[PDB]
Amino acid sequence: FRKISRDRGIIDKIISSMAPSIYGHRDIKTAVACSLFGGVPKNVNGKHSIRGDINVLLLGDPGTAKSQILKYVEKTAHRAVFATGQGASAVGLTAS
Amino acid sequence: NGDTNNLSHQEQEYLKEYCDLITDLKSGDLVDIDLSGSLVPPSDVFIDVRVLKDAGEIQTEYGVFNLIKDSQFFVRQSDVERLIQQGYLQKI
Amino acid sequence: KIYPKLHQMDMDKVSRVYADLRRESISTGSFPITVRHLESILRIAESFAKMRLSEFVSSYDLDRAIKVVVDSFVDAQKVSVRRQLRRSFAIYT
Amino acid sequence: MSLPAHLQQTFSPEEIQFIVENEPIKIFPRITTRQKTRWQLITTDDKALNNMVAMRSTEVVLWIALLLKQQSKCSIVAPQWLTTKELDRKIQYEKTHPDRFSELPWNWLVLARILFNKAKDDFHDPIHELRGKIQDLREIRQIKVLKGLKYLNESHLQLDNLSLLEINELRPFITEIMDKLREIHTASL
Amino acid sequence: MYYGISQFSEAYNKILRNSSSHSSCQLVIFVSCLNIDALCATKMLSLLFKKQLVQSQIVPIFGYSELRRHYSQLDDNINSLLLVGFGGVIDLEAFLEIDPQEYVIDTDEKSGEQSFRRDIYVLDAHRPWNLDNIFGSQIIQCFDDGTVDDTLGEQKEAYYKLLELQRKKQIHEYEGVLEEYYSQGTTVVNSISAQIYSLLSAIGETNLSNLWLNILGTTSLDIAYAQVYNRLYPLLQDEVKRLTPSSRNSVKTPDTLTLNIQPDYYLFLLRHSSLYDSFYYSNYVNAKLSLWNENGKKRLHKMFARMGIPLSTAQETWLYMDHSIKRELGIIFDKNLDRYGLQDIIRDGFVRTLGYRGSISASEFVEALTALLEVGNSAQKLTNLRKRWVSNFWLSWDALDDRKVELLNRGIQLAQDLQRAIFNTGVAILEKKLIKHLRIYRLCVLQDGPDLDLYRNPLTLLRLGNWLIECCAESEDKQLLPMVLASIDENTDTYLVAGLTPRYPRGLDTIHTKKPILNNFSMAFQQITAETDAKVRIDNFESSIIEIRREDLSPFLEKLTLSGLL
Amino acid sequence: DDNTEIIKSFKNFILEFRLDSQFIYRDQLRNNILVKNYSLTVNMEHLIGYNEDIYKKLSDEPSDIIPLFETAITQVAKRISILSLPTFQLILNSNANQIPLRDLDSEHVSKIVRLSGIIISTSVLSSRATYLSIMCRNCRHTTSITINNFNSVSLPRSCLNCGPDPYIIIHESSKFIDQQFLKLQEIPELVPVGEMPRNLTMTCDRYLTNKVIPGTRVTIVGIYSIYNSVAIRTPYIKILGIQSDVETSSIWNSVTMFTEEEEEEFLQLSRNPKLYEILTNSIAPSIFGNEDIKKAIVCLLMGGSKKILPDGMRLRGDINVLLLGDPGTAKSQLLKFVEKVSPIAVYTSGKGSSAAGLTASVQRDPMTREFYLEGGAMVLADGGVVCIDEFDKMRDEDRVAIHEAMEQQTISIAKAGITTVLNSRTSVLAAANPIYGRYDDLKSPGDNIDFQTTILSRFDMIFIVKDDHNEERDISIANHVINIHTGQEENGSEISIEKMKRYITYCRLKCAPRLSPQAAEKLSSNFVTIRKQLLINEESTERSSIPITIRQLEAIIRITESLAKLELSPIAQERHVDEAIRLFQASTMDAASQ
Ligand SMILES: Nc1ncnc2c1ncn2[C@@H]1O[C@H](COP(=O)(O)OP(=O)(O)OP(=O)(O)O)[C@@H](O)[C@H]1O
Ligand SMILES: Nc1ncnc2c1ncn2[C@@H]1O[C@H](COP(=O)(O)OP(=O)(O)O)[C@@H](O)[C@H]1O
């Protein structure tokens, strides 16, 4: 991992490796990679809490390979949960 | 030894006259004693003091003390008692 | 195992980008812009730094995050004003 | 006014110490002042200081003794009552008689504190043992004081052999309570 | 003139004779504000003068400008002046505008000597001595440790012949030898507290408190000048043996005071933190394991696992750690430290205990004092900062008393925090590879750190410099090179450049390691400042630390590289 | 044998310890005995310093060694107090590393551990047996038993012919002590990934009872023991010492606990000529601007004064604040900070709330089959602040349950045969968004607010925060946030959270100012002017959605009284009236005019 990281073009390879079976959408792959890696949460002096996660939304045409991208993200992420529109309740999410 | 806006005019005049009376009392046969002095019995002849507020080379009756802030003296309590009273020095 | 930090960064660049984004987003019906998106720019810079297992965010990562956010904002606009928006924001991207 | 409120009707501990340091004490001079300048004091006697010989018992004032001790020019001879055996005897006397107080010196607490702080190497016995004995004596006397405080009345009251520091500590409460009881009784008539 | 080792008693008697009158005070002591050794020496002197009822004033001082100001402000009733911790290298007569004629009182033709109202005593451990103060001047008296008689006979002869004067060739030879003597750098040769203790032993006022202060003063030099500490250690051992009661069978009492030579360790605050923290925040351990990256942490975890100490147990505080492991620690270290190259952690130190209180070692006490000195709590801001440091001096002074233990605990906590901050800064420096390597010297410049404010104090900068010197430089088998460390403060827009001498690998006795390494940066900095025009400040007592304007650092470093006198 | 030696060692430690010239524990024991406080607090560092062997013995077998220490303490107390007294209690203090609540396992069985958590439930005091008097049924043999509360005891199985278990306890001659049960949860920040918070059963005795209230973080020192309710044991904690950051004794009693050194620190702070600015700057230091909202939060924290009239009528003294604004205004962060700083506070989400959640719930006991009442956020946050985030998300049904709580400060329950009136004296700080997510100036205010006037009238101050895109303010906020991300005045311009909380408690428990006649006259004039302006501002198309009733006059009076209380001033003058009027104009009239 260290040897791979030392390479200059590591970010480009990482982006290209996101869902290799999807032809293009290099803007939906970059966002997915950024969300997967995420940010660093911060707690300033113990009083201020700042979120350290990245949320992504895909608003597109019916056949532009969005569900496949979500499935790939589910496979790659360490802990992932998949839910459908109407298949999810207000307390099925969150806690009940 | 011998703000005012809270006081009334009568109280201010009373305070001035009382200070004058105290000075007159100190000017009498009790000149050797300093009536307006410390009421804590003397315990140690020599003490360590520390300068709290910067001031020039103030020439006291006992001697000349160049009160540089943050500087310690090993002197007699009697000599620097007044300076401690006014807050220039500290016993520590 | 990686928690990157920001120590050297162009404050003026990010501030100007945020101000320009707000000014262009004042338009009715546009994509909302708030301090959340400045924090998102910083978060994306942190993520890009993390992708290299680097312990400190570099200027290149911040520039890439700025480009990503500005490109998304530009693409979110309408056809008529997209050309003007892209020309205006060409400096950052 | 001229006198603060906390110095009214009572003495502060510093005043009690000042009173105590006027009493005599025995010392061993480490210099020879006697001839075979001259002290000229106006509050105490200066004959003893002038006729001082090395390693010969002499009597001087406690504050002068402490001043000499600071210069390591005299070793203070501790009081006889400040021995472990004598303190143990006093503790036994206190325990056997729950109604009276032991005949300790009127300045035992103040003198003990002064000597412990200023003259630590002069004592023949370990300091910690003396501290423990003094603490035990103090607690026993405190128990006796608490038991005896239940008899406050409009008439007189007797507290024999009670030391100066304890009387100074108890003066406010005892005096005020007895004054109020006397006031109530006088109003009753 | 100078006083030999045996003349300390005579100098003390002279001070007693002149500056002693209950009517008024006539003794003033000037102390370096940011030197622990000077602090301890002045504490010893203060106690000694309190014993004899000598009226005195103690004035902390930072830099030569403040020395000049305070000396100009001195009264005429000061018969004797004490310069503790500085003044050896500079010409006090020339610097202070002291004209002997205006200071004389009486002159006797028969005696051939002149009496002066004011006398100046110099207690400086730095070298080389300024021959003007040693062999030329009479008002300036220097407390020499024997160096002048041991090695300065030839320079003495040369200077005397120069004063006494075909003759051009002889003058050339004498001035050449004088210049060669003056061309060397500056180092520390001895501890001033050791000289004060020698004086006390001469006049027979040595006790356990004086010995403790001497130990603290001597061990303050262990971090930088280990050769001096090694030279002075046997005497401290012998003195501790002499002053310790023969019988220790008596049970502990509330007033018992112990001073033992117990095995100490090159760990950071072992007795007031956790063992894991002690190994983590130690300069030597980090140098020998590279704890600034993940590999070092993994190696430390592996070491702790092989020693048999659970990670939870190791992170437990010292007081509540399992007693079996605490008792076995010596054996455990004896058998396991050699594997990871930490064989040098084993050492013998001085540990002081009070009845029913915790035990603290000399190194931990010095660390607490230094932490209190550092973080305890245009020209106007500089003056305010130096005033704050002068104030911190008194917190450090108070911490030396046994009644003020809360100050010592606060200093320990501040030391922990400061070490954590320095570790973070060093991690940032090393990860970014900011240490540029030039053939003549190394360079490291801080510009946008997270804790830049902490490094305005010279002591914190020196701490960071030592951390960096031990780590990745003392090791790696790299040729010794002086290091340049610079920091920036935005509130004033100026730099704080500090030259640092290289160090040999710790605990490696060798003929070349026996020889010392001199600090030549003062001479080069002075020459560059005189030749260049950048408004540089050399007012600090430690001549290697200077303040540089924001713009001029690049030309200054160019000239430094081109000079080749480092 | 060995027990006597252990007792002697403990007695020697008590009677011989000293760090300078005061016997700390001897004097402490005497002082405690003087005020009928039969206990003794021992710092474990001192025990380690005196003798490490004693500490080793105590740590090895706490359940068997602590009773000996209590016996030694009792003997020393009898020696020191009686001139020739139940068993004394030992309370321990330690600085050992805190073990996470979830890390407690088999390895920590029967050992002294330190941990911190949140108390979620407390039980009713029970009665334990210490001295039992027993008698045999057949031969009537009198006997006694002495019981210690530390569990590794029963009535004799054989008399001293008599059948098994022949002894019967005589009650009138026995002595009992107090016992309580607590439920301790783990801190939310310490919970592992994707796990529910864990509960732990704990017990306290005698002087450690009635020391904590539900919802307060505490630190506990105790023994990790087990009790058999077949191859398993139920874990529990035997409390030996409780340390909390909230003075619960001074909250539930009119009595106030503050050291003389504290009282004089809070007086000096109050004497500061500009304490208002310091407190305004001390709230949400990481949030830029919003000065008026910070002042409103200060007023809400301080609160007003409550008056009970001779006729029985009671007047509310709590201040409620509503924040209706656009996204990114930092309302939720302000709510979180308020929850953090207030002595008592509960942070709740409107979405994730219910009618029974936020008031009280009828719950049936599984065993007794009897119905009891549990408490909700407005009972758990009694005497504090309730931060109702996402106020708009709340269902109507749920919402409607809040009215009496806010106004009458009581909860009325008539369910499952339970008829009671609970007490809920709380302040509500709510945040919400408009109907469309932004305050569209094109549409009327009525269309931007779905809140009925009844709920809105109860809020003393309503803040309509609109995000305006100004280049200068945007640049300033960006710079502030960047400095926050990349990055301690404490020079009298700001005080930490702990000091502010303590000062709030002191001010609430100490001062309750009153209005002067000039203040009343000015307030009446302003109320008349405001009502006249509202009447004028009305348009024929719609009636004012933001109301102005007598409740607003009461709210302004409360704000003035809180401002006066801020400085510990017994009387409120026109100077505070002006500030209260300015705040009302800046928030409520500002919302209404639009
Ligand atoms: N003035 C400010 N200073 C600092 N941070 C700010 C400021 N304004 C907004 N933020 C940040 O913007 C983010 C907004 O999230 P927050 O939950 O606080 O918003 P909100 O006002 O409650 O909005 P919403 O109605 O969408 O829930 C937070 O990270 C907050 O830190
Ligand atoms: N860019 C693309 N590259 C490769 N395959 C694609 C691409 N876009 C669509 N497809 C194919 O078309 C199908 C799209 O279905 P899906 O993406 O699941 O529908 P939706 O986009 O509504 O989620 C997928 O089975 C995928 O294989």
Ligand SMILES: [Mg+2]
């Ligand atoms: Mg789909």
Ligand SMILES: [Mg+2]
């Ligand atoms: Mg929100």
Ligand SMILES: [Zn+2]
């Ligand atoms: Zn029977």
